[PDB]
Symmetry: D3
Subunit: 153 residues, 6 copies
Amino acid sequence: MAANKERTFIMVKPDGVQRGLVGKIIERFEQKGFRLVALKFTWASKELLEKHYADLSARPFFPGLVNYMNSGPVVPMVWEGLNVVKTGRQMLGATNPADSKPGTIRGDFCIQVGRNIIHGSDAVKSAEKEIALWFNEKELVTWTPAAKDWIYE
Amino acid sequence: MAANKERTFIMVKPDGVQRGLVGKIIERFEQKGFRLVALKFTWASKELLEKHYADLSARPFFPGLVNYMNSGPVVPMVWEGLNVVKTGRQMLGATNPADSKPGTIRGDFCIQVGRNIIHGSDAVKSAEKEIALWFNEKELVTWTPAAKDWIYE
Amino acid sequence: AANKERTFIMVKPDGVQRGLVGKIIERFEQKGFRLVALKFTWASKELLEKHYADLSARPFFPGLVNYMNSGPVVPMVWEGLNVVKTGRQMLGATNPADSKPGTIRGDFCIQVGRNIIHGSDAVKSAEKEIALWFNEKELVTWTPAAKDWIYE
Amino acid sequence: MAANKERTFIMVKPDGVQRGLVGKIIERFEQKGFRLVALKFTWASKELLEKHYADLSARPFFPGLVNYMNSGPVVPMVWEGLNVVKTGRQMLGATNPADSKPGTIRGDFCIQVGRNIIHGSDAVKSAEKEIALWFNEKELVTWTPAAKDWIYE
Amino acid sequence: AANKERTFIMVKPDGVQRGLVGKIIERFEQKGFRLVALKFTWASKELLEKHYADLSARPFFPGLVNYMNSGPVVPMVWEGLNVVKTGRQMLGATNPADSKPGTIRGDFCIQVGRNIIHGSDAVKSAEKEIALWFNEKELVTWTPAAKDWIYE
Amino acid sequence: MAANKERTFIMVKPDGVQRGLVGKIIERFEQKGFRLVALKFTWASKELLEKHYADLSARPFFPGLVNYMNSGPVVPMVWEGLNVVKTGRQMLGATNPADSKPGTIRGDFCIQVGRNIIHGSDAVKSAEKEIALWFNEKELVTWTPAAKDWIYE
């Protein structure tokens, strides 16, 4: 419940892996002061993707979206810190890269919304759901950064 | 006329060359996913510069502008991609660097509007004219990036 | 004189601890701003109370002074056109949660009491801060080779 | 057996995670052209560590080494490519950072051998063993980078 | 004249494809070397056979020519003290497996037939290469503001 | 006399300042894990410079050297850590930048030996003398990095 212990789900999409952006994305979160909680590299099954995108099941683009997200591997992650959900979204930039400003991940590194390299949870509740979908609890690491008292009041 | 095949004219100005920013500027376009079409290094004639800046010929300190832009070599370039004209301008930042936001090229690397290191076309129509002014069609390279299908849907 | 405006920028104890001194300096150098003064020091509470005198009516004032006295800092002076206002823009909003990506605070820190860097908020406060942290002898005058490519 | 499909085990050690080097290390391998095969974030058990370091079981420093490696989380990874084992070791630099040259991971980012931020397999056979210790086969991802034919003859 | 030595450096098709043009240019700029000529072009096999004439006795010559004709390249000329020899050192060993971290090839590529960049191996071959790829009209003469801080 | 508390003198020379390398140089020391102890920006007197370069007073072009080092401001620094004198020199690279390897400071950023951007002490004994020459003891800051126990065993 503690503000500083909020968690979000960030995922490098197949285009982000293909284009060599995994390290650069992780570095953005590390240098900011956010704390890694979970990390893996996986080819997501259509089953998992259909759960992740379940709200979109009736949309005409849904099958193509699932097929695309199943067309190469992804890097799911969990990050922890104060307002990491909303601040994470800020760091990512607008969902449509056209509107993402320079300095943001999407603003610096991609062009078109269907190839927008990265996903971040849009709310605390959706983050909790996404974390539970993509990770089991034993994959979530609890640790204490040496720099903690220089990052947080 | 294909949206993804739009081209813009980007030029490193004499101060950008002098201050060692050519590579950094090209890198920003490459990492974004835009496609290089043309590139050269040249000392622009006053004649060419007067055509490029024709819109300013009846405004203050035109001979001064032309003389300054003829005082050192420049790096004219052509870049291709979806909305590259508008997005290019966004990447450059506001023309006056005090208004340019951090993260942008002008925002990060210069200070004063008459020493603002870079130019980008302001519209599709002016891009077509600028490209034709600074390059011959034989200098425009046709090629296909390996990563194309991870940049564009 | 316009191009000779100066501002006070200081890396805070958390900026030093988290290894951001060079990165911060690099941001001002690459922009075209000119270094005028630089040092590394543990600031006394007496000095810090003067530095933050404008905030003395605020509940967080003693905590700010105590915190800023908990590790060393890197006071600096930078010179150039509109460097106070532009400096503030480069630093980003005082509260990092509101600072945009691309700014120093937006890229490198999270919470306002650990916001890594200070910059003067106006020409007048810059003049005050520069005089507080430095002797005139420590302010170096010189001219960058690139000056005519930065200013007309 | 194919030369280009050789794999090695690279692990960010607890000090490397603590000091915010995970993204930077991954970026070194991505930018080189090597291909990510597996990635995770974990607190290694003493059981696993005693298997990883089994050859050292009789050494007087063994218990302290295991305790230290169990004192914070690590980032185990697998990378694929031509001579990735030996070239990986080259990229890491000498095991003792004192002897690691600038440009290498250890040369750029650490000081003392007991806090030397990273591990890489020292031979193809030891890599195969380490990969099997730290990962299961289902965690190893097979995929094809768009850039493959620009990285390999 | 010593400080006016020139070498030919070219980003190969794999360097262009993998988005390394700016990074390569930046390495020479930050070193203090001076850009003299730059372009982007698809090279003909006729040109490439002349460029690689020294290697015509080798079994890999036709494959090298064909490969170098498979995508566009970025030919360049750089100027400065011992730029041919120092350029080669910056590029790293021709075979990337032998190129050390810190060099262009050591940092950015893996296999010798995909080794991203070419640099002249001697003053004489540089003179030949510069004349092959550029007209004298394309070689720009100018003087960097920082010159006196790079050379005495 | 503690090994880990060794200190060296590092100075950005006038060309390093002029060419905008101060931050980059400091960053290389920070990222390595060395500890900043002292830092200033000053225009060095000929008197001070003659003491610093006393060993060269009977060698060619001494007045020229002194005049050049008095032609622009410098950034004197003190850094602390295990074998920081020797490792510092390794990080700087060979004194003549043509011999300095890529990855080193001189290797990456300069060309000619009399314009070689940086100085580092050549031994523990010369460091002690240089530190005492350029700084007062009151300017040497005592502090403890949060990451110390992840840098040193």
